Design an enzyme around this catalytic site. Structure first.
Site, PDB file in Angstrom:
ATOM      1  N   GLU E  62       0.847  -1.223   0.000  1.00  0.00           N
ATOM      2  CA  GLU E  62       0.000   0.000   0.000  1.00  0.00           C
ATOM      3  C   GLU E  62       0.871   1.257   0.000  1.00  0.00           C
ATOM      4  OE1 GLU E  62      -2.989   2.638   2.765  1.00  0.00           O
ATOM      5  OE2 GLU E  62      -1.114   1.701   3.438  1.00  0.00           O
ATOM      6  N   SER E 131       3.074  -8.591  10.960  1.00  0.00           N
ATOM      7  CA  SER E 131       1.913  -8.941  11.819  1.00  0.00           C
ATOM      8  C   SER E 131       1.134 -10.050  11.110  1.00  0.00           C
ATOM      9  CB  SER E 131       1.041  -7.755  12.080  1.00  0.00           C
ATOM     10  OG  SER E 131      -0.120  -7.788  11.261  1.00  0.00           O
ATOM     11  N   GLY E 135      -2.806  -8.501   5.690  1.00  0.00           N
ATOM     12  CA  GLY E 135      -2.697  -9.184   4.388  1.00  0.00           C
ATOM     13  C   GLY E 135      -1.250  -9.350   3.976  1.00  0.00           C
ATOM     14  N   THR E 136      -0.588  -8.264   3.573  1.00  0.00           N
ATOM     15  CA  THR E 136       0.840  -8.305   3.194  1.00  0.00           C
ATOM     16  C   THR E 136       1.622  -9.008   4.272  1.00  0.00           C
ATOM     17  OG1 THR E 136       0.476  -6.305   2.038  1.00  0.00           O
ATOM     18  CG2 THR E 136       2.775  -6.793   2.556  1.00  0.00           C
ATOM     19  N   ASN E 197      -0.415  -7.456  21.334  1.00  0.00           N
ATOM     20  CA  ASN E 197      -0.625  -5.999  21.507  1.00  0.00           C
ATOM     21  C   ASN E 197      -1.355  -5.778  22.827  1.00  0.00           C
ATOM     22  OD1 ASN E 197      -0.087  -5.333  18.414  1.00  0.00           O
ATOM     23  ND2 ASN E 197      -1.640  -6.953  18.521  1.00  0.00           N
ATOM     24  N   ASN E 219       5.065   0.412  20.036  1.00  0.00           N
ATOM     25  CA  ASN E 219       6.151   0.136  19.058  1.00  0.00           C
ATOM     26  C   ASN E 219       7.514   0.507  19.646  1.00  0.00           C
ATOM     27  OD1 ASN E 219       5.900   0.233  15.463  1.00  0.00           O
ATOM     28  ND2 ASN E 219       7.291  -0.884  16.843  1.00  0.00           N
ATOM     29  N   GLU E 245      23.204 -18.163  17.717  1.00  0.00           N
ATOM     30  CA  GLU E 245      23.097 -18.939  18.976  1.00  0.00           C
ATOM     31  C   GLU E 245      21.627 -19.166  19.345  1.00  0.00           C
ATOM     32  OE1 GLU E 245      26.056 -17.586  18.083  1.00  0.00           O
ATOM     33  OE2 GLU E 245      26.850 -16.689  19.929  1.00  0.00           O
TER      34      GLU E 245
HETATM   35  N1  LIG Z   1       2.370  -4.214  18.518  1.00  0.00           N
HETATM   36  C1  LIG Z   1       2.214  -3.397  17.482  1.00  0.00           C
HETATM   37  N2  LIG Z   1       1.382  -3.755  16.445  1.00  0.00           N
HETATM   38  C2  LIG Z   1       1.214  -2.929  15.386  1.00  0.00           C
HETATM   39  C3  LIG Z   1       1.878  -1.716  15.332  1.00  0.00           C
HETATM   40  N3  LIG Z   1       1.529  -1.110  14.177  1.00  0.00           N
HETATM   41  C4  LIG Z   1       0.670  -1.908  13.504  1.00  0.00           C
HETATM   42  N4  LIG Z   1       0.454  -3.033  14.250  1.00  0.00           N
HETATM   43  C5  LIG Z   1      -0.393  -4.182  13.885  1.00  0.00           C
HETATM   44  O1  LIG Z   1      -0.668  -4.145  12.500  1.00  0.00           O
HETATM   45  C6  LIG Z   1      -1.928  -4.723  12.247  1.00  0.00           C
HETATM   46  C7  LIG Z   1      -2.574  -4.055  11.038  1.00  0.00           C
HETATM   47  O2  LIG Z   1      -1.640  -4.008   9.982  1.00  0.00           O
HETATM   48  P1  LIG Z   1      -2.054  -4.585   8.543  1.00  0.00           P
HETATM   49  O3  LIG Z   1      -3.441  -5.170   8.610  1.00  0.00           O
HETATM   50  O4  LIG Z   1      -1.014  -5.599   8.136  1.00  0.00           O
HETATM   51  O5  LIG Z   1      -2.038  -3.374   7.486  1.00  0.00           O
HETATM   52  P2  LIG Z   1      -1.185  -3.534   6.128  1.00  0.00           P
HETATM   53  O6  LIG Z   1       0.281  -3.706   6.415  1.00  0.00           O
HETATM   54  O7  LIG Z   1      -1.424  -2.344   5.231  1.00  0.00           O
HETATM   55  O8  LIG Z   1      -1.753  -4.873   5.439  1.00  0.00           O
HETATM   56  P3  LIG Z   1      -2.847  -4.810   4.267  1.00  0.00           P
HETATM   57  O9  LIG Z   1      -3.839  -3.712   4.550  1.00  0.00           O
HETATM   58  O10 LIG Z   1      -3.552  -6.138   4.175  1.00  0.00           O
HETATM   59  O11 LIG Z   1      -2.139  -4.524   2.967  1.00  0.00           O
HETATM   60  C8  LIG Z   1      -2.732  -4.560  13.523  1.00  0.00           C
HETATM   61  O12 LIG Z   1      -3.289  -5.799  13.880  1.00  0.00           O
HETATM   62  C9  LIG Z   1      -1.738  -4.152  14.586  1.00  0.00           C
HETATM   63  O13 LIG Z   1      -1.757  -5.081  15.643  1.00  0.00           O
HETATM   64  C10 LIG Z   1       2.718  -1.349  16.376  1.00  0.00           C
HETATM   65  O14 LIG Z   1       3.322  -0.278  16.355  1.00  0.00           O
HETATM   66  N5  LIG Z   1       2.881  -2.194  17.450  1.00  0.00           N
END
Ligand SMILES: Nc1nc2c(ncn2[C@@H]2O[C@H](COP(=O)(O)OP(=O)(O)OP(=O)(O)O)[C@@H](O)[C@H]2O)c(=O)[nH]1
Ligand SMILES: Nc1nc2c(ncn2[C@@H]2O[C@H](COP(=O)(O)OP(=O)(O)OP(=O)(O)O)[C@@H](O)[C@H]2O)c(=O)[nH]1
Ligand SMILES: Nc1nc2c(ncn2[C@@H]2O[C@H](COP(=O)(O)OP(=O)(O)O)[C@@H](O)[C@H]2O)c(=O)[nH]1
Ligand SMILES: Nc1nc2c(ncn2[C@@H]2O[C@H](COP(=O)(O)OP(=O)(O)O)[C@@H](O)[C@H]2O)c(=O)[nH]1
Ligand SMILES: [Mg+2]
Lengths: 54, 428, 433, 428, 430
Positions: E62, E131, E135-136, E197, E219, E245
């Site tokens: 994206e 995560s 998706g990605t 999280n 984060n 290790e």
């Molecule tokens: N622990 C933690 N989780 C994060 C943070 N930032 C994003 N996430 C996680 O990222 C997830 C959402 O990211 P995605 O759905 O992958 O968004 P994307 O990377 O654009 O993936 P797509 O929309 O499918 O292309 C959430 O479930 C969050 O838990 C962060 O700073 N800390």
């Protein structure tokens, strides 16, 4: 390599502003161009105001 | 060193060429009296293609004024650029053709063609290396359809290796001026298919449709129709007048557009045409220029390209711009609309770019297309010819002027042969 | 003592040479007037007279005067000799028959007279560099006629070609496949080494490796100009491992009918990008062999690498070159033929390339140009043969050629000879068991 | 570079777009004319998703306004933001449908679709990555109900993957503007179940409610009601426009709110809607906005979600806010109310946090909820159709416009099918 | 020398990268510009000058998250190309990210990753942040991992991932997107560090005092954990521990390779100056069942292993005394076949503070990658969740139409089933 990047960035801005200058001259030459204005002056002829253009 | 001799016959041919020499003089910086009050030296570098030297920095066009009626010469002198032409080049008859192909070709144009040819050899042989000729006429009239084709035959028996160009104005039924125009058009296409190296078919109703919906004019007169034609003539021959980053003159267009010597009827168009109210709504870019270029709505012919297949396509551009952007756009129009191009030619679109745009323009382009879909232009004329020939409608005007029935039969036969030959190459 | 006469034919040849001679003038400090502001290394390209003039050792030939008269009225008006710029009056109009038989045969006597005047002026002549394009009329017809006249008059003298090979998808002409097949068949054995570039690849190079969008032909000719300068850098500048022009036919073309190596220039990066990375010898060596950094639009993994010639400019260490090529040979992504276990020509030069004001390139300390002769060029010929016979089956556009003094049977002679070349590459592309 | 072509169809649609476009323009900063007079940078970062770009900094909207009668569109032009729209995207007809789905889908709507499909393509052609289209229209009319469905069909075919949302205005449970509403709507729904990625269903009834018990507005105009549809609109496209902590997209929202294909009929709703006097006595905190978006009253559809199980939920919170809260104030809902969320889908809620907040607001949200309560809407539209088709009432009007009687029953079946699916899952 | 390429995939990844590389910068003193005003080598490369470009490949289908970096404070730190983005997202659909929308970026990425591996003389391994619920982050990550194994050979392909939360769950298709990714990554990942999280939310409220935390605070903490997994690779220590290790002393049987992370002196400044955080104090806390990174109660399983990484001023004697104590208490139980139990790695560099962070400059800190069997509860919840949906064939059209058979889902849940069995077999004591 840094002064080239600043020179290239200023050149692209200058080319963009020069593009907008002859874009406005493009439009201004259309609104007075004896085609879109539809002025009743193309009918003027060399023989006189009475004879007009056929 | 590549001169073009301009010919024009008929009222339609004279009025189109009067606007044509007006547009060229504005581009080349020539006042109505004939002196170069221009700015760039790039203007006065190839003036010799169209104009001739006269004493005192004066430039006279290499054009001959041909008509059978003296009333058209008063019209062309009443224009703003009526004094630029040499009076020796005005060859006008005494009795009009009267929408008669027989009078224009056999009995009334036969004594005037010698006077016209003397002027033609007068201008042709003063050039060190002449490239070709250029004729503007209408196929519905008498002078243009009859004497215009006579000049085509008589200058090609003396200059066979030179290119021949004719800007024909074929009639269209939905805007009908004369009733006898299917007779004049049928008798004249045979002289076009056998002689002219390249020809352009101009439809009056497509010009009116462009002037109604593309340019949005309240009262479009004939001068507006002639301006759209004249911009196409300038766009076609802008290569040999101004430098370009990769060039294509008249002959190289004729080589890459004509695959077989009977296939040279083109489908002209002009790209930068927008209305007054939509001037500020457009972004002057190459993708918009190409997108409006291939539109059937912008086309200067009444036959729709979707009904046939593009045999070859030309693209002559004017202005400073990029080449990848142009080269990708002609790649995009071939790939998406693959059903609208013939399969046996893999590269249907050629590209010409000149670095100098027209005066008042930053960018311009002209469209040349040899398409199969022009066969429906001739097929709709032929069905209006066989409707009149069967009952022998207006034939006593022609038969009493020295031509036979078999000439009308052989003209329709050669015309149907061209349409069938277009049909065979669409099938492939 | 190291001179080479550079012939520029066609609009593509002339417009490339404008950027080439601009680069040559900036390298040796010769102004567009032809006078140095304040050595003898310019002799390979320029000929100093009794005064301070330095006229180039080149001829500019084209049948259409709308390109050369720009040079005759441009910034480099006083550099070029007036007789060295030769024009006709009518172009070849994408007709190989016009460029070879009718119109081009008129102008061949004046060009060969000017070439032999330059050759008699030379004391250490090495070869001829001819710039043209496969898709034109003058660039395919008059180029081909020039090779027949050069072979009959000069013998086994070296002749290098820099031609715009037709791109797989983009084309500016319709009869462009006709000229490309015709000019190749008659230059197969009158040419010694014909280096290949395509316009699409440079468009892709300018889009993804350079930062510039909407590229023009001016950027294309400068990047080609950098290659020919890198090819001829060893004659003019001090080098650790010198490379001659007689070299290229020895170490690149293995068989007489196959002389189409692929030119490339790996360190082609913009100034903003160049700040963000180093340009080490290993980084520029393996950037040559990348399929995305090829200046010929064909995948190099589709075929077999036959001969490679790498020329290095700048502060390049020969040990770093030896380490970089060794890592290339141990890589299994690219593969060489079994009958050429060496497959590498190494060239080292000391002077980095001079950056041109207004150019999209950056100031680089190291530069590399790789000339690779590959079996993967066979897919370009097969695709070009597919375009040729798609119109030759219905005899499309053949009436423009038979009507200009050339026989119809030459079409059936060039394509049969080109079909042999299709599986000459197939013959050399198999391993021996 | 995602972009959305907005096809506003019909009177309702042309007025919906007039306010939708005004609203998005006020966010991006584009003024009545079209120049960025804004006070940020992200306001111009991703404007390609809705506006194109002319010369001078004019950002023309990428929209096609269609209608079978010029009236409403001429009225739209003469308004506030009525000069942004390109003058060549106002495709209009000369004979309206007259509350007749037939005329709009087979008679006069079918002589305009061609012209619309042209404009549609041109706008979708100049699109790096057209994320999809968007049709705001009414389901109880003729150009909105008929030509709308015709366009959604022809478009869905020509352009597959591309998302195709629809802000459809369905009939009310009480009064009825059009007597033929039953037919019109029933005949249209069938098509909206086959050629729409995600259809949002707004009912004017709800607008009155949320403009009387929520906005304490005594004299609401259709424009005040249209501002509400315009707020919901932006909410489903706020993450593909302004940056965010958790980003969403039309497609992503569809993936996490359309369980089985057929069910694409959602229910929209805003969040910080507050009265004028009840403005200073508020506490903009995620806690508060999440007590309104789920409050049945703040829905924009008739279906009450206490008679049905939310199959899914999609909250798009626009406002720099505490991620923890967004989450902590989501479980609470799924927990506290535990019988109004299906059990066969563990987590029944999608969350997205765009940062740039609605103009003149700190924290807002847009909720889209697939609920088995939507079966109510189609049950009503069907009980009406039944009564009418039984006594074959205004059938004649539809019949003789290129239509039959079986298509009517076909439609009725198609509807009873979707309502069966809904119930099935509700009880599953 | 001993470098480590970092490939972040998706919003989570891109954003995690931002926090991580910010810390890396303020640790090796590399200002946002990219210059210092050979510890850096591991993570930062170097031009001939002093421009230390990071060794990372931020990839996201994206065009938005990476764009905030392209135009931000650390804009001129990252190389313009390293940041690789696409045109449309994977719409929370493993399919798009692993078959359709993700099969057009794989080339650019693997190409650039190779270009950052040609400058690496001792590539320990690739760190893959992502995560599972996205998706990605699920599709592309699995995609990359596959071709990563075939191209970059047998390297320490470690993976700091974010597993779905017990209750909270951004997307609804998370069960599916996270089962279809384990099935493929199970045999293409060395150590998959699980960090949820909702656990970090609880920490930010209980340990630090930041009520209403944002993904920033969460984060920032993740970055401190990654700084400690790679602190002996950069800074110096008495007992240094390399990335290679961990795999040996943490992954017992192959399949079982999902360790859980934990920090230690997570205190607010107002608390920092109220407690003498001792080596025992930090250790005892790194084992308590409320400071864990996943809400899997470790008081339900058996520590199949443990790797305690001490950072800062940590006398080697106390680390023994502390570990001895842990060993005493019976609550902390270890499997029988792990009689040794712990692996210690001491690094002298003290944890660094971020200008506007949450934790207060400590003098000592400990991070513990622990392989408890109590992570079984995680997959068990996820398995039900998946089963609760596949049965009704819900959201199955969003995958079958994007280059994927329905059979795959079943095949994946059988692998999920197997892993849940293995995690139980390795528990059954002799
Ligand atoms: N622990 C933690 N989780 C994060 C943070 N930032 C994003 N996430 C996680 O990222 C997830 C959402 O990211 P995605 O759905 O992958 O968004 P994307 O990377 O654009 O993936 P797509 O929309 O499918 O292309 C959430 O479930 C969050 O838990 C962060 O700073 N800390
Ligand atoms: N490198 C380069 N190639 C060009 C340039 N212009 C055109 N070409 C290529 O050259 C081919 C044709 O050559 P031309 O430039 O037309 O010149 P020519 O070979 O003499 O052909 P004509 O003069 O048109 O008869 C085209 O297919 C283009 O791909 C240019 O400026 N630089
Ligand atoms: N485009 C254009 N067409 C014209 C013009 N004048 C006449 N015509 C066309 O020419 C046709 C009549 O030709 P006519 O004057 O009789 O030709 P002539 O007998 O040879 O002089 C009509 O159908 C008109 O459409 C003009 O100025 N421009
Ligand atoms: N919310 C809202 N609904 C409107 C508006 N204008 C019209 N409508 C609805 O549109 C319905 C009528 O659709 P109709 O007027 O027949 O559309 P047509 O097909 O273009 O003639 C009525 O039930 C109104 O409730 C508006 O501005 N806002
Ligand atoms: Mg030329």
């Amino acid at each position: 390599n840094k002064n080239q990047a600043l020179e290239s960035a200023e050149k692209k801005i200058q080319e963009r502003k020069q593009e907008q200058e002859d874009n406005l001259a493009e439009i201004s030459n259309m609104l007075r161009g004896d085609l879109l204005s539809e002025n009743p002056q193309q009918a003027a002829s060399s023989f006189g105001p009475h004879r007009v253009v056929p | 060193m590549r001169e073009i001799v301009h010919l024009q016959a008929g009222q339609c041919g004279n009025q189109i060429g009067a606007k044509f020499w007006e547009v060229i003089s504005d581009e080349h910086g020539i006042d109505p009296t004939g002196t170069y009050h221009g700015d760039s030296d790039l203007q006065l570098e190839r003036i010799n293609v169209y104009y001739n030297e006269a004493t005192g920095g004066k430039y006279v066009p290499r054009a001959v004024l041909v008509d059978l009626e003296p009333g058209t010469m008063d019209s062309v002198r009443s224009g703003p650029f009526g004094q630029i032409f040499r009076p020796d080049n005005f060859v006008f008859g005494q009795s009009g053709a009267g929408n008669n192909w027989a009078k224009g070709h056999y009995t009334e144009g036969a004594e005037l063609v010698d006077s016209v040819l003397d002027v033609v050899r007068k201008e042709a042989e003063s050039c060190d290396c002449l490239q070709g000729f250029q004729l503007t006429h209408s196929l519905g009239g008498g002078t243009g359809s009859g004497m215009g084709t006579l000049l085509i035959s008589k200058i090609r028996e003396e200059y066979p290796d030179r290119i021949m160009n004719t800007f024909s104005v074929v009639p269209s039924p939905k805007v009908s001026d004369t009733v006898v125009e299917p007779y004049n058009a049928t008798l004249s296409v045979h002289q076009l298919v056998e002689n002219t190296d390249e020809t352009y078919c101009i439809d009056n109703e497509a010009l009116y449709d462009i002037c109604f919906r593309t340019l949005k004019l309240t009262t479009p007169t004939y001068g507006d129709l002639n301006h759209l034609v004249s911009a196409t003539m300038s766009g076609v021959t802008t290569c040999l007048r101004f430098p370009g980053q990769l060039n294509a003159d008249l002959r190289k267009l004729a080589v890459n557009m004509v695959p077989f010597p009977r296939l040279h009827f083109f489908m002209p168009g002009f790209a930068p045409l927008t209305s007054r109210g939509s001037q500020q709504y457009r972004a002057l870019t190459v993708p918009e220029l190409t997108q409006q270029m291939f539109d059937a709505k912008n086309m200067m012919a009444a036959c729709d390209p979707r009904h046939g297949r593009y045999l070859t396509v030309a693209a002559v551009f004017r202005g400073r711009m990029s080449m990848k952007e142009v080269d990708e756009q002609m790649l995009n129009v071939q790939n998406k609309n693959s059903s609208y191009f013939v399969e046996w030619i893999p590269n249907n679109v050629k590209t010409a770019v000149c670095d100098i745009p027209p005066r008042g323009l930053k960018m311009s382009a002209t469209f040349i297309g040899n398409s199969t879909a022009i066969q429906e232009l001739f097929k709709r004329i032929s069905e209006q010819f066989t409707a009149m020939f069967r009952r022998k409608a207006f034939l006593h005007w022609y038969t009493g002027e020295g031509m036979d029935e078999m000439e009308f039969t052989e003209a329709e036969s050669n015309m149907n042969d061209l349409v069938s030959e277009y049909q065979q190459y669409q099938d492939a | 003592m190291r001179e080479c006469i550079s012939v520029h034919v066609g609009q593509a040849g002339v417009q490339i040479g404008n950027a080439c001679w601009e680069l040559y003038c900036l390298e040796h400090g010769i102004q567009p007037d032809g006078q140095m502001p304040s050595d003898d290394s310019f002799n390979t390209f320029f000929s100093e007279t009794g005064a301070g003039k330095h006229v180039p050792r080149a001829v500019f030939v084209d049948l259409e005067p709308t390109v050369i008269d720009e040079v005759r009225t441009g910034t480099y008006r006083q550099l070029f000799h007036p007789e060295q710029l030769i024009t006709g009056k009518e172009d070849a109009a994408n007709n190989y028959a016009r460029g070879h038989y009718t119109i081009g045969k008129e102008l061949i006597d004046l060009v060969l007279d000017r070439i032999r005047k330059l050759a008699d002026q030379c004391t250490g002549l090495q070869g001829f560099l001819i710039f043209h394009s496969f898709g034109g009329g003058t660039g395919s017809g008059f180029t081909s006629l020039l090779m027949e006249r050069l072979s009959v008059d000069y013998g086994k003298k070296s002749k290098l070609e820099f031609s715009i090979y037709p791109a797989p998808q983009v084309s500016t002409a319709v009869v462009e496949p006709y000229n490309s097949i015709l000019t190749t068949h008659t230059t197969l054995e009158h040419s010694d080494c014909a280096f290949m570039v395509d316009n699409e690849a440079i468009y892709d190079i300018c889009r993804r490796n350079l930062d510039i969008e909407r590229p023009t032909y001016t950027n294309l000719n400068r990047l080609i100009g950098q290659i020919v300068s890198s090819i001829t850098a060893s004659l003019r500048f001090d080098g650790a491992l010198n490379v001659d022009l007689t070299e290229f036919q020895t170490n690149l073309v293995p068989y007489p009918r196959i002389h189409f190596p692929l030119a490339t220039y790996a360190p082609v990066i913009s100034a903003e990008k160049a700040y963000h990375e180093q340009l080490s010898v290993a980084e520029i060596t393996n950037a040559c062999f990348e399929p995305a950094n090829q200046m010929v639009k064909c995948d190099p993994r589709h075929g077999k690498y036959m001969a490679c010639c790498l020329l290095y400019r700048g502060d390049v260490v020969p040990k770093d070159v030896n380490a970089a090529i060794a890592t290339i040979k141990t890589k299994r992504t690219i593969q060489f033929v079994d009958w050429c276990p060496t497959g590498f020509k190494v060239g080292i030069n000391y002077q980095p390339p001079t950056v041109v004001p207004g150019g999209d390139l950056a100031k680089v300390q190291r530069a590399v140009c790789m000339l690779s002769n590959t079996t993967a060029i066979a897919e370009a010929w097969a695709r070009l043969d597919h375009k040729f016979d798609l119109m030759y089956a219905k005899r499309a556009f053949v009436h423009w050629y038979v009507g200009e003094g050339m026989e119809e049977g030459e079409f059936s002679e060039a394509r049969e000879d080109m079909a042999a070349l299709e599986k000459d590459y197939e013959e050399v592309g198999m391993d021996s068991v």
